[PDB]
Amino acid sequence: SMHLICQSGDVLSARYEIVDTLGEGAFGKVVECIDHKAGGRHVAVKIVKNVDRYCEAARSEIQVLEHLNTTDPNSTFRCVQMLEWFEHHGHICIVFELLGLSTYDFIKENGFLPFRLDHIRKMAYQICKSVNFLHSNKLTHTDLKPENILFVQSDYTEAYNPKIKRDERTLINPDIKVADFGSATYDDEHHSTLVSTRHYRAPEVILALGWSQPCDVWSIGCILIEYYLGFTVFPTHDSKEHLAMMERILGPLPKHMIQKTRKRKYFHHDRLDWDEHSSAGRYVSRACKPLKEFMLSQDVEHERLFDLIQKMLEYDPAKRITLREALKHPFFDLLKKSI
Numbered sequence: 001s002m003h004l005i006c007q008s009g010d011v012l013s014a015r016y017e018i019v020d021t022l023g024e025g026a027f028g029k030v031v032e033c034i035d036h037k038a039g040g041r042h043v044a045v046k047i048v049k050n051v052d053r054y055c056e057a058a059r060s061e062i063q064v065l066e067h068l069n070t071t072d073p074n075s076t077f078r079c080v081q082m083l084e085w086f087e088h089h090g091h092i093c094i095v096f097e098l099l100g101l102s103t104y105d106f107i108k109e110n111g112f113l114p115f116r117l118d119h120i121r122k123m124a125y126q127i128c129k130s131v132n133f134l135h136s137n138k139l140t141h142t143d144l145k146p147e148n149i150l151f152v153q154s155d156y157t158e159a160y161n162p163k164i165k166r167d168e169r170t171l172i173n174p175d176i177k178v179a180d181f182g183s184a185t186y187d188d189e190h191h192s193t194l195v196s197t198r199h200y201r202a203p204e205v206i207l208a209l210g211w212s213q214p215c216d217v218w219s220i221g222c223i224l225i226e227y228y229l230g231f232t233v234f235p236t237h238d239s240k241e242h243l244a245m246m247e248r249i250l251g252p253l254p255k256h257m258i259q260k261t262r263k264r265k266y267f268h269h270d271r272l273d274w275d276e277h278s279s280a281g282r283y284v285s286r287a288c289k290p291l292k293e294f295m296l297s298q299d300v301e302h303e304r305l306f307d308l309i310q311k312m313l314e315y316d317p318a319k320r321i322t323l324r325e326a327l328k329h330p331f332f333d334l335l336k337k338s339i
């Protein structure tokens with residue numbers, strides 16, 4: 001399938017000439033192309049793996065992007081713009097505007113160093129604005145992560161930082177768009193039990209208590225921590241271990257969530273079925289600690305970021321801050337000071 005249809009100099013749909021690879025995943029591959037029928041404009045083309053699950057996701061993504069791009073033709077709310085779609089050797093191919101590196105790939109190529117706070121503020125504001133627009137449209141993204149947040153243009157300057165003894169890349173312009181609408185779900189359509197990538201998954205999702213727009217707010221909180229530290233505070237590939245890290249970082253789960261959950265496999269009576277002295281138990285207590293102990297400074301702007309993160313990681317999904325409320329949080333006041 002994929003390896004065999006996607007090399008430099010291939011022309012797709014009689015107009016798109018491949019010149020470079022932008023990204024690969026289990027989903028397929030994104031290539032950079034010259035569009036010979038739009039005056040040589042460069043575009044991105046996603047070539048989707050010919051596998052039921054990713055075929056079904058691509059067809060759902062095309063329907064979501066047609067709606068979102070028509071509703072917001074000026075891209076005021078910063079969703080990726082889809083130009084068209086076609087089929088190539090029976091693979092679904094989606095054409096987009098050409099953007100820059102994903103926030104994940106930038107962090108990777110910067111030796112997993114974090115962003116400076118001023119970029120995190122601008123990036124956080126734009127992400128909340130974009131995903132609030134989806135929420136206004138009775139949609140939930142469900143899979144927000146640093147790989148799905150794209151820079152518009154990833155040009156950088158580089159200098160030695162003697163503070164950390166590391167060469168460091170800084171963006172010229174940190175402006176972002178949101179991508180990857182393949183899992184996005186309307187209020188009135190069927191809700192899968194399993195949504196989100198492990199490290200960004202909300203507690204109501206893990207405990208199968210029903211989910212909606214607030215599971216996107218949890219994901220965004222986890223994204224801001226990774227932007228701030230350069231690593232996840234949930235380094236795990238196990239549902240119960242994840243819950244144990246949550247309790248160490250954020251405090252005990254609310255009693256009403258433990259007693260409603262059908263996920264009895266995680267629990268012994270009314271508490272997590274957890275051995276603090278096992279291999280996983282030792283790891284969790286070495287690797288995890290109270291959230292505010294991860295702060296790198298006590299400056300007020302650091303306190304303002306950590307107050308927003310704490311609100312976004314409220315366990316109860318009704319109590320949890322909405323993105324409409326988040327855009328008014330004091331961390332963003334610096335962005336709104338007169339021009």
Ligand SMILES: CCN1/C(=C/C(C)=O)Sc2ccc(OC)cc21
Nearest residue numbers: 023030044096098099100179180
């Ligand atoms: C590789 C990221 N990527 C996408 C990924 C998915 C899963 O859809 S969609 C997309 C559009 C433009 C782009 O330009 C560089 C990149 C781009």
